[PDB]
Design a protein. Structure first.
Length: 136
């Protein structure tokens, strides 16, 4: 019932999302789908899962590039690590490359258009949590 949610982002992007989400913490806990989760949101830079947020070509690449490091690194010791890709608001190229990245990882890809859309945060959140639930 405690989930360690890491959040990757470039240029404070992971921090803004962590902040956005924390403002909704009732009693330092979270209500989703009629349940109450204690989430520990840990934004990062260079039960658990990983939010990956990007808003441009550069941020998308950092995420790719960073997942690659973890990949190569992971080899010398991952398949079930609950990723979820979040695109935060030509837009079409972002979605297409993000969706191929999502496809490669077999992870949900969510678009989040009040800087972030609450309904979309929730979908993203249920993404990671249903994946976490699946791994058990």
């Amino acid at each position: 019932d405690k989930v360690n949610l890491f959040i990757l982002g470039k240029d404070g992007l992971a921090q803004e999302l962590a902040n956005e989400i924390r403002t909704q913490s009732t009693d330092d806990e979270y209500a989703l789908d009629g349940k109450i989760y204690e989430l520990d949101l840990r934004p990062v830079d260079a039960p658990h899962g990983c939010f990956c947020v990007f808003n441009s070509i550069e941020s998308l690449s950092f995420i790719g590039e960073f997942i690659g490091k973890i990949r190569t690194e992971a080899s010398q010791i991952m398949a079930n690590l609950p990723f979820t890709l979040i695109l935060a608001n030509n837009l079409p190229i972002l979605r297409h490359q993000g969706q191929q990245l999502a496809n490669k990882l077999q992870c949900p890809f969510v678009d989040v258009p009040r800087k972030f859309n609450e309904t979309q945060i929730k979908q993203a959140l249920r993404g990671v949590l249903e994946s976490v639930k699946h791994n058990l």
